[PDB]
C-alpha cells in the first residue's frame, strides 16, 4: 500500500463517479421500464435482470466508498455482491448475444423461443449459474490485519477465469462472426441481383438500338444468363419466380427469331420484356431491397457494443489475473501488482455505469434514450 495516500483520492473519485452515473442511469432505466412494465418480449428480461445485478452492486457500494487503512460478514457480503456483479454481467451479456445470434440467423427458431417461458427459463438458469459461481469463493472470511480482501497452493484461479471469462469471450466472438457473415453474404446477394437487373436492362437497350442480328443474339444470351440466376435469389416467391419464368420464355421467343434471322421481329418480341418486368418484378425489387436495416441493425450494434464493453471492462482484469498466475509454476509482491489490479477492478466496476450505454442503443425502452 505504498500509494495509499494516492488511493485515498483515486478510489473514492472513481467509485463516486461510478456510483452517481450508474445510479442515475439505471434509475431512469427502470423508470422507463415501469413505463413499459409488461412488454418484455425476449431481450428486455435479460436487460432488466442485468439492471438488477448492477443496482444491487451499487446499493452494496456505500459501505465500500468510505475507505482508509484502519466488520467481517458485511465484507463477505461485499465480496459476494462483487462476484454476482461481474459474473452476472458476463453471462447475461453472452446470453443476450446468443439471443441476438439466434434472432438474426435462424429467425424461425427465434420465434419458436421468443415466448416468455423458455426465455425466462434460460434467464433463471444463468441466474442460478451465477449464484453457483459466487459461493465457492466465499469460504473464509476476508477480514485480516477494513477487510484486506485483495491477496490470495492456488489452482482454481485460472479454472474459474476460463469458465467465467474465456468461454464466454469465445462465444460472443463467434456470434459476432456469424452475424457479420449472415449480414454480409444477404448483402453480396442483393448486390449481384442488382447487377443482374442492370445487365438485363443494358442489354435490352443495346437490343433496341442495334442492328445486325448476330449481336442481338449476343445481347439475348447475356440477358438469359442474367435472368436464369436472377430468379435464384413461399406463396410470394412462387409469384416472383413465375415472372422470371415468363421472362425467360419471352427471351427464348425473341432468341429463336434472331436465330431465324428476323432482326426487326426479334426487336419487337424483345419489347415485351419491359412490360413483363413492370408487371411482375418491379413490385418485388423494392421489397427484396428494403425489407430483407431495422431490427438487424439494432442486433449488429448491440453485438458490437457488448464486444467493446467486454474488451474494455472484463479483458484487462482477467488478463491481469492470468498474467499474475502465469508468473506461478516457475517462481516485492506489492510491486506492479496492487495498482494494476486496482485499476482493472476499477474498470470491471466501471462496466456498471457503461451498462446504460448498452440500453440506450440496444433495448429496454429507448424512448427516453432518444429523448
Amino acid at each position: 500500500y505504498a500509494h495509499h495516500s494516492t488511493a485515498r483520492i483515486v478510489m473514492p473519485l472513481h467509485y463516486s463517479l461510478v456510483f452517481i452515473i450508474g445510479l442515475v442511469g439505471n434509475l431512469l432505466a427502470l423508470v422507463v421500464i415501469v413505463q413499459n412494465r409488461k412488454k418484455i418480449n425476449s431481450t428486455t428480461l435479460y436487460s432488466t435482470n442485468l439492471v438488477i445485478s448492477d443496482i444491487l452492486f451499487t446499493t452494496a457500494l456505500p459501505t465500500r466508498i468510505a475507505y482508509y487503512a484502519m466488520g467481517d460478514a458485511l465484507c463477505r457480503i461485499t465480496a459476494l455482491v462483487f462476484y454476482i456483479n461481474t459474473y452476472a454481467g458476463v453471462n447475461f451479456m453472452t446470453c443476450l448475444s446468443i439471443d441476438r445470434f439466434i434472432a438474426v440467423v435462424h429467425p424461425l427458431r427465434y420465434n419458436k423461443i421468443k415466448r416468455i417461458e423458455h426465455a425466462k427459463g434460460v434467464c433463471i438458469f444463468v441466474w442460478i449459474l451465477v449464484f453457483a459461481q459466487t459461493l465457492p469463493l466465499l469460504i473464509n472470511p476476508m477480514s485480516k490485519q477494513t477487510c484486506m480482501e485483495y491477496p490470495n497452493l492456488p489452482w482454481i484461479l485460472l479454472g474459474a477465469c476460463f469458465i467465467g471469462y474465456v468461454l464466454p469471450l469465445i462465444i460472443i466472438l463467434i456470434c459476432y462472426s456469424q452475424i457479420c457473415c449472415k449480414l454480409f453474404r444477404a448483402r453480396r446477394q442483393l448486390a449481384d441481383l442488382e447487377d443482374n437487373w442492370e445487365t438485363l436492362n443494358d442489354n435490352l437497350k443495346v437490343i433496341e438500338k442495334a442492328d445486325n442480328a448476330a449481336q442481338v443474339k449476343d445481347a439475348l444470351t447475356k440477358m438469359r444468363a442474367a435472368a436464369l440466376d436472377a430468379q435464384k435469389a413461399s406463396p410470394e416467391m412462387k409469384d416472383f419466380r413465375h415472372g422470371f419464368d415468363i421472362l425467360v420464355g419471352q427471351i427464348d421467343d425473341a432468341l429463336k427469331l434472331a436465330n431465324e434471322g428476323k432482326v426487326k421481329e426479334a426487336q419487337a418480341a424483345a419489347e415485351q420484356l419491359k412490360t413483363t418486368r413492370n408487371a411482375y418484378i418491379q413490385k418485388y425489387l423494392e421489397r427484396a431491397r428494403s425489407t430483407l436495416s431495422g431490427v438487424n441493425k439494432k442486433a449488429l450494434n448491440t453485438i458490437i457494443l457488448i464486444i467493446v464493453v467486454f474488451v474494455l471492462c472484463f479483458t484487462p482484469y482477467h488478463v491481469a489475473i492470468i498474467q499474475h498466475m502465469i508468473k506461478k509454476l516457475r517462481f516485492s509482491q506489492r510491486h506492479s501488482f496492487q495498482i494494476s489490479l486496482h485499476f482493472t477492478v476499477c474498470l470491471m466496476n466501471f462496466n456498471c455505469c457503461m451498462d446504460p450505454f448498452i440500453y440506450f442503443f440496444a433495448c429496454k425502452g429507448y424512448k427516453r434514450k432518444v429523448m
Partner: antibody, heavy 124, light 109 residues
C-alpha cells in the same frame, strides 16, 4: 422405358448423302427436343443440330450449316438428320439426345437419355 | 460461341482417392452446366445437372459445385468403375451447347 435408337450409319463417298434416323420409345418427340451430338474418332463431343417439333426451331452448328437438315416426323415418333455434301472430317459417331422444354426441371436436366450412337465413315 | 475450358486433361489416381475436375466458361452462364461420363465404346451418361444437383441413378460420391464461372466436379472415393472420360457441357440455350475437352481419369501406378 425411354430408349433412343439410331440407324443409318455406314460408308459414303466424300460429297455423298446419308440419312440418320433417331427412333424414340417411351416419351413422345412432341414433349422433348431431339439433338444430335457427334464425336470424331479419338476426339471430344460436339453439338451438331436440334429440332423442336412443338414449334419448329431447326438450328445447326456453324460447321454444318447449309449442309445438314434435321426433320421430325412425329407420326413415326422419330427424328431424322439428312447429311449430304459430306466432307472428310464428318466421320464420327452420331449420338441422339433428348432435352426437355422450358420451364421447370425438364429443361434444367441436360441431355439425360442418349442413343447408342451410329458410326458413319466418309472415305473414297 | 461460349468457350468451355476443362483444365486437367488427364488425371492419374488410385482406388479410394479424391479427384477434382474443374471447368471454366468464357461468358457467365448461370448454374447450367452438366457433367458426363463416357466409358470407352459406350454413350455418355448424365451425372450432374444444374451444376450442383446429382442426377437420380448415379452413386452419391460425385458432387459438383459452382463458384462464379468456375464449375468443378469432385469424386470422393474413386471406386474402380469411375475410370472413364468426364466431359463438361454448358446448356444456356438450345443452339448454344458447347462441351469441354474431356479429362481421362486413369489408374495410378
Amino acid at each position: 422405358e425411354v430408349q433412343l435408337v439410331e440407324s443409318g450409319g455406314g460408308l459414303v463417298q466424300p460429297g455423298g448423302s446419308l440419312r440418320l434416323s433417331c427412333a424414340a420409345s417411351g416419351f413422345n418427340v412432341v414433349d422433348f427436343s431431339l439433338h444430335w451430338v457427334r464425336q470424331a474418332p479419338g476426339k471430344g463431343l460436339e453439338w451438331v443440330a436440334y429440332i423442336s417439333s412443338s414449334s419448329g426451331s431447326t438450328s445447326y452448328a456453324d460447321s454444318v450449316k447449309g449442309r445438314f437438315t434435321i426433320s421430325a416426323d412425329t407420326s413415326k415418333n422419330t427424328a431424322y438428320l439428312q447429311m449430304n455434301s459430306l466432307r472428310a472430317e464428318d466421320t464420327a459417331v452420331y449420338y441422339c439426345a433428348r432435352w426437355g422444354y422450358w420451364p421447370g426441371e425438364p429443361w434444367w436436366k441436360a441431355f439425360d437419355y442418349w442413343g447408342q450412337g451410329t458410326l458413319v465413315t466418309v472415305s473414297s | 460461341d461460349i468457350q468451355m475450358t476443362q483444365s486437367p486433361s488427364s488425371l492419374s489416381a488410385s482406388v479410394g482417392d479424391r479427384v477434382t475436375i474443374t471447368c471454366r466458361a468464357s461468358q457467365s452462364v448461370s448454374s447450367a452446366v452438366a457433367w458426363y461420363q463416357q466409358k470407352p465404346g459406350k454413350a455418355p451418361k448424365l451425372l450432374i445437372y444444374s451444376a450442383s444437383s446429382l442426377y437420380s441413378g448415379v452413386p452419391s460420391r460425385f458432387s459438383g459445385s459452382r463458384s462464379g464461372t468456375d464449375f468443378t466436379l469432385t469424386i470422393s472415393s474413386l471406386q474402380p468403375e469411375d475410370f472413364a472420360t468426364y466431359y463438361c457441357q454448358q446448356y444456356l440455350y438450345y443452339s448454344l451447347v458447347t462441351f469441354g475437352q474431356g479429362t481421362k481419369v486413369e489408374i495410378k501406378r
